[PDB]
Amino acid sequence: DPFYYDYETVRNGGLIFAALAFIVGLIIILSKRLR
Amino acid sequence: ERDMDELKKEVSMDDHKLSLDELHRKYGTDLSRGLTPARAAEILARDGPNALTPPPTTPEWVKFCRQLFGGFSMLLWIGAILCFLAYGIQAATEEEPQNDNLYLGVVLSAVVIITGCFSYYQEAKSSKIMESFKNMVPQQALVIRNGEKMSINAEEVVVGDLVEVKGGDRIPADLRIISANGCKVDNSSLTGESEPQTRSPDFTNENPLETRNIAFFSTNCVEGTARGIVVYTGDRTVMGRIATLASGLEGGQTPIAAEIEHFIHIITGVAVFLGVSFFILSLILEYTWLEAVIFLIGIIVANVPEGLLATVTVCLTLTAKRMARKNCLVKNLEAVETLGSTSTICSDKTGTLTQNRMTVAHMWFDNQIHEADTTENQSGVSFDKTSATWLALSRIAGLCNRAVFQANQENLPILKRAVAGDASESALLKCIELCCGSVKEMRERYTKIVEIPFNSTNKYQLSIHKNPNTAEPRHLLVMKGAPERILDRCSSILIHGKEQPLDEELKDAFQNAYLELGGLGERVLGFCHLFLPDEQFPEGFQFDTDDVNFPLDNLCFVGLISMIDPPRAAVPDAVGKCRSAGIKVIMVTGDHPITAKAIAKGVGIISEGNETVEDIAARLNIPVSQVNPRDAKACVVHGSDLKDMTSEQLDDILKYHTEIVFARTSPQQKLIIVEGCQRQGAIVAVTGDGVNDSPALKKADIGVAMGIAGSDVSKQAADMILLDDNFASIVTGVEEGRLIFDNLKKSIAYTLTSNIPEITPFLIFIIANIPLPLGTVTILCIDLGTDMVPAISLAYEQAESDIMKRQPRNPKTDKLVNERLISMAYGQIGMIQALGGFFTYFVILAENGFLPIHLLGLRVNWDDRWINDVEDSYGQQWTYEQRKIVEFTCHTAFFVSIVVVQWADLVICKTRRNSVFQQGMKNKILIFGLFEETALAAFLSYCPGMGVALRMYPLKPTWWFCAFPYSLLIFVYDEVRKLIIRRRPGGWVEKETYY
Amino acid sequence: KKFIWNSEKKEFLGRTGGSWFKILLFYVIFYGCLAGIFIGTIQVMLLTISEFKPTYQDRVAPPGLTQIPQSQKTEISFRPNDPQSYESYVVSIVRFLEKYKDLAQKDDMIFEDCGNVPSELKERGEYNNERGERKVCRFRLEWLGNCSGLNDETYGYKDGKPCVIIKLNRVLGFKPKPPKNESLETYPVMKYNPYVLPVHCTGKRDEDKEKVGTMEYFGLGGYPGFPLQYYPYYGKLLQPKYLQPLMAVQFTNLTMDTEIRIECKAYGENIGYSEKDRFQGRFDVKIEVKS
């Protein structure tokens, strides 16, 4: 079926990235030793 | 306001008639020791804190609701209401309808809730931090409890407490005078007249206001000292009933916020005009009545920077906190912006530039210079302690002294103990106690009959003592003061024990020694005494102090004593930065011109090369009157000359001089200097610590009062309080004042940049008739949802390296929002961001089947919900929702492109003068915003269900990188622009783009 | 008037003439370089996609079923007695049907005759220009029973017997596959031709199924659908005069002056449906012959 683009792959990649960036931002804003 | 002389004269009932025994038995207080701490706490918990009832505080559920239903949120609320109403209208019509209008309304409501919550969070942070200053340095009251005198919080004062106030002290509460010695209070705030009225324990008048044994609340002790007993506290005070209901503050206008309000009203007017014009345009374009309000809301949102006021509040409170942490307490929020515009700083020499820690180092007696005060190694002095003249010098230096040592000090040395008196008197005490003996015995033998304190009228001290010897005429007069003035009041000098007439040679030698010690940066004091003849003044003679009868002139000069007072540590660096920032610093002291000149030259006030008229005359051996007045860049104006000068001469000296130093200037003359400085069109900052400085502190643009040695009058009469009295703190505050302007402008340049890329899609959609590239839901998620944190991150940026290398700013011409700022946000960066978003839009549409050229004019059939046969560039047929999904994917891509270009815009906005590589990414909140907005966009694009909720669909990977070149282009362009501005100051680039 | 213009330094609206020209020239080189870089990026982007095949096609899949004439809200209501109440529908039907007359398909190089009955798909090969243009399977309007624009120009609208021609969304590189006889147990009864993609019109509610009347399906070879021999489509670059297969439906013996919503649905393996897009695979038409 050359009419179906695997959207679950991109969706999971984007969600994983969003979670990673959110955890990093949370660590930066709530930094323990990043002064 | 008929609240004075009418609502005060009748509400009055006191106990001034009660005697010491009646007062003691009524209030129950130890007149000689004060109440016990236990009783003090008992009364504090019984009557309540010594304060006025505060105004009602709005609860937490009031501000939140008032923000939720605010002004801007009202448009979104009405939009959501219209959407819900349209969904109900569609539910009554055709069965099985869609939930598009319902989802749109729910989205608008969720957006309103999030916006209100974030705004309330920031407003709560601002109000909570602002309140932190009211409890930074509370006002203290010196009370006497359990015999000991201690300083406690003003609100901890209870009725009956034994309170003691002195010159410059604020009256804690209504008191009943018990003991007083020449106390003068100012009832200007009470009766109106500023004439100081004396206060005495004796009952003088039955009226409480006219009596002399009562001190009222809010008044201040101008001169003297007294002890009273609290008769009324808190709201019960006489002045309290008036100050709680008739002394409320008015509507003080803050220009830093007013300018933003004006710019906000103009941008709001233009935004609403474009919104209504587009509303009618869309209505004419055969569009739904609800879609017209949707386009209107989107345009207003993307064109009105609704967080500007919040950004201003955040920047102001943050810098206020910064100044507070750096020994600069701003009493009001307006002074925080006046500091950045400071151009003339009239500081004092003793107390601010120096540490006021004097130490006796050199002396002059027997026509010789003597160093002394050995390093407490019992080495004594460099001369013999048996010198006859030295005895007559130490005698008048210890007897005329008024300072004494406190208790619990006989276990540690004299060079590290505590004293009670003048710094000069403390140095003299530590000197005569380290090389002569004990002053407790010398002052006891020579019993003092009458003493004249230091007065501006006399300009000298005085003390008459009976001598217990046998070959003296039972009377010894001792006095110290200005060495020059003490010299003119004497006819003889003591040389190795023999008194000889003071000839011209001795006076010339004295002048040489004075110039020698004064050029060393030391304050010199003159001393003299006289053995009044016994024939004229017998043993029973009574010297009158009020009616001077004893001889005041023709005394016997004994010697000079000089002490060292080193300047503060960062003072040389502070004046260097001030000279490097175009801020004129003026020294205002009451010391001798030689000492003031030497200290000014040493601390950096008078840098190398600059000479005064006197220096030029001495260098070319010509009379000072022959020298050209304009040939001296610096000058040392004497007090006598300032008194006999006119406004013209004042403007002349203050205009054609770069380094001015006013010596022997009384503290009252500071007002004239401040007026003359303001007359030259300069924002003046003046330092004050005494009570006489108040006119100068109130008249000046920025009154800085000493927080340690400064009295309550100066603190309440000033605009800023120096927590450490260090001059370097003023420069630090000026720098932070410039920092608020810098960060506010950088933040504005960023919040306004997002306007062009967010509003251009509609303009092209209407002029080029291409499918809508950016939707309203996307615009809301951008402005109100992602750039909420980045817009504030620009406030936490640090200062550039050129913050202290630029000229001061004048508020009359330099404003925040200027033409160069708009030319940057709307003309250069905005255009690049819009092109980047459009590029990604064309990429998506071309990759899905619609070539960029073919898209022109297709919007008519694109929005048509029944033409489900749209032919693409390849000839394929698309339905309505099929192509609408692509348009929405384009909206999401445009949003991602917006975030991408926002990264570069935020980075380049961190600095406006230096390169991003010099400033660095030390801003943690900025990086946090950089990560959070990208993560939020990624979530809004990849979260499941968003395709049917927010109409945002997943974005393919090969698209997230479409706007990268535009981001890099913005970055390189801003860096090269800043590079050209750095390499060519005052150039066209600077005069055209430097906002 | 001072801000409007001042004669001291020749300042107009706020700035002098020299600065006016300086900013005009700077803004011209700037906006020019920006639009030039924009066009450059646009061309670099165009050099990525192909000219005879789009880089992404999942957005147009499955194809959507459409009807002719295009009517607002898919409502076809007219007065059979009125000679003008149906003029719009016939006008839009003819505007599209004229492209299928025997006169348009004259040239033999571009128009080739394909099987008069459902046959196998005519795969032209590869999506390139190696063979230049491609032939187009001719389609005579006569394949439509009574509504062809040859014998009856009213198409039935004059006697209250509408003919709503059905059409399949053209998609490049799509190979339709009709349902197999093995799974034939849910869709209604219709001719089973493995070489034709069928379509069946039904009512929408219990009232519609009763008041519709008698469906008369017209298509190539008498089969209710589209012959598989007319696919795949190679786009406007390879087959510019490509004619898509057609099929019409006649609604005879219908209730007069009553709104009836009918739904024609296409079946097949690669033909799906959607809850939000009511035109993907199936479509609904509302008719009312108010005589």
Ligand SMILES: *[C@@H]1O[C@H](CO)[C@@H](O[C@@H]2O[C@H](CO)[C@@H](O[C@@H]3O[C@H](CO[C@H]4O[C@H](CO[C@H]5O[C@H](CO)[C@@H](O)[C@H](O)[C@@H]5O)[C@@H](O)[C@H](O)[C@@H]4O)[C@@H](O)[C@H](O[C@H]4O[C@H](CO)[C@@H](O)[C@H](O)[C@@H]4O)[C@@H]3O)[C@H](O)[C@H]2NC(C)=O)[C@H](O)[C@H]1NC(C)=O
């Ligand atoms: C949609 O297309 C179809 C294509 O097939 C058309 O179908 C026609 O429908 C009409 C109407 O029902 C039918 O007429 C019936 O004919 C019956 C007997 O006809 C016989 O002779 C026909 C041949 O002679 C005719 O046809 C040729 C062309 O084919 C003409 O040139 C010629 O001059 C003649 O006119 C045979 O073809 C047919 O098979 C028979 O052998 C009649 O019994 C019938 O009358 C009954 O019904 C009437 C209506 O209620 C009623 O009033 C009467 O009292 C009686 O009860 C009716 O007339 C055709 O048979 C049928 N086929 C053809 C080929 O015409 C259809 O017309 C078209 N729709 C429209 C709207 O035009």
Ligand SMILES: *[C@@H]1O[C@H](CO)[C@@H](O[C@@H]2O[C@H](CO)[C@@H](O[C@@H]3O[C@H](CO[C@H]4O[C@H](CO)[C@@H](O)[C@H](O)[C@@H]4O)[C@@H](O)[C@H](O[C@H]4O[C@H](CO)[C@@H](O)[C@H](O)[C@@H]4O)[C@@H]3O)[C@H](O)[C@H]2NC(C)=O)[C@H](O)[C@H]1NC(C)=O
């Ligand atoms: C396909 O379409 C046709 C045409 O609409 C339908 O047949 C009927 O056709 C006639 C036209 O001549 C329509 O008009 C008239 O309707 C009147 C209403 O009465 C109705 O209700 C009574 C109940 O008491 C029924 O018994 C009666 O049959 C009607 O349905 C009638 O009074 C008229 O009478 C004429 O017809 C009858 C029966 O045909 C004759 O016996 C009489 O002598 C007289 O000539 C006439 O019927 C009528 O409305 C149409 N009926 C409808 C629309 O239901 C076909 O029914 C339709 N096909 C299908 C499957 O429904």
Ligand SMILES: CCCCCCCC/C=C\CCCCCCCC(=O)OC[C@H](COP(=O)(O)OCC[N+](C)(C)C)OC(=O)CCCCCCC/C=C\CCCCCCCC
């Ligand atoms: C003070 C606090 C601040 C917070 C700020 C952050 C705000 C975050 C906003 C929303 C959070 C979302 C939470 C999780 C939502 C997913 C729920 C879920 O599990 O749903 C899963 C299903 C997926 O189905 P499927 O994959 O089979 O798709 C097939 C459908 N087909 C075939 C038609 C394509 O989805 C469905 O069915 C139903 C889809 C429901 C989606 C709900 C998303 C939100 C909807 C309305 C709220 C709007 C908030 C907007 C805030 C924006 C702020 C900028």
Ligand SMILES: CCCCCCCCCCCCCCCCCC(=O)OC[C@H](COP(=O)([O-])OCC[N+](C)(C)C)OC(=O)CCCCCCCCCCCCCCCCC
């Ligand atoms: C049918 C087409 C309709 C097109 C409508 C286009 C509208 C464009 C406007 C978008 C938003 C603009 C917001 C401006 C907000 C300004 C706020 C402010 O206080 O600015 C003060 C600033 C001034 O700052 P100031 O007042 O603080 O400082 C003044 C300094 N002195 C005194 C020296 C001057 O305003 C400006 O600098 C001027 C901005 C002018 C902007 C003009 C935009 C014109 C738009 C032309 C579009 C043409 C389209 C042609 C299409 C053809 C198609 C075939």
Ligand SMILES: CCCCCCCCCCCCCCCCCC(=O)OC[C@H](COP(=O)([O-])OCC[N+](C)(C)C)OC(=O)CCCCCCCCCCCCCCCCC
């Ligand atoms: C799975 C995805 C994860 C994504 C994580 C994304 C995080 C995004 C947050 C920021 C990134 C985007 C902005 C970067 C801004 C860098 C600004 C800067 O110059 O900082 C200098 C500064 C300079 O300051 P300094 O402190 O290092 O130097 C100071 C020097 N003195 C002391 C003399 C003043 O340093 C940094 O910011 C350190 C980090 C730099 C990170 C750079 C990343 C990009 C690198 C090259 C550009 C892209 C090239 C792409 C080539 C592609 C080829 C195919």
Ligand SMILES: CCCCCCCCCCCCCCCCCC(=O)OC[C@H](COP(=O)([O-])OCC[N+](C)(C)C)OC(=O)CCCCCCCCCCCCCCCCC
């Ligand atoms: C073949 C080469 C390919 C290169 C590909 C790109 C590689 C990455 C490009 C840059 C990354 C490294 C940057 C180092 C920057 C300087 C760091 C520094 O601290 O210098 C301090 C100096 C400042 O020194 P200073 O003396 O002022 O500060 C130090 C003060 N003390 C000593 C007290 C600590 O930096 C500068 O003056 C910066 C000038 C920058 C001018 C830039 C002009 C062009 C605009 C952007 C340039 C390109 C950006 C990247 C574009 C990438 C595109 C893909």
Ligand SMILES: CC(C)CCC[C@@H](C)[C@H]1CC[C@H]2[C@@H]3CC=C4C[C@@H](O)CC[C@]4(C)[C@H]3CC[C@]12C
């Ligand atoms: C160093 C700086 C300038 C670059 C910024 C980081 C870039 C490379 C990051 C930011 C967000 C990232 C994207 C986040 C989510 C996805 C979805 C995933 O399924 C494929 C990768 C993709 C598309 C990522 C590619 C890398 C990306 C675009």
Ligand SMILES: CC(C)CCC[C@@H](C)[C@H]1CC[C@H]2[C@@H]3CC=C4C[C@@H](O)CC[C@]4(C)[C@H]3CC[C@]12C
């Ligand atoms: C792409 C096309 C249609 C839009 C072109 C917009 C032009 C006509 C508009 C857009 C923004 C405008 C600029 C906005 C701000 C200023 C600053 C002012 O001190 C001089 C005029 C100047 C420089 C304007 C000149 C006209 C200008 C450049």
Ligand SMILES: CC(C)CCC[C@@H](C)[C@H]1CC[C@H]2[C@@H]3CC=C4C[C@@H](O)CC[C@]4(C)[C@H]3CC[C@]12C
């Ligand atoms: C040294 C500098 C100037 C190189 C600049 C390279 C430019 C021309 C490159 C860098 C990134 C590129 C883009 C990266 C990703 C995509 C998505 C793809 O599906 C179509 C092409 C497109 C839109 C590219 C077009 C060309 C592009 C913008």
Ligand SMILES: [Mn+2]
């Ligand atoms: Mn003072």
Ligand SMILES: [Mn+2]
């Ligand atoms: Mn003031």
Ligand SMILES: [Mn+2]
């Ligand atoms: Mn924005």
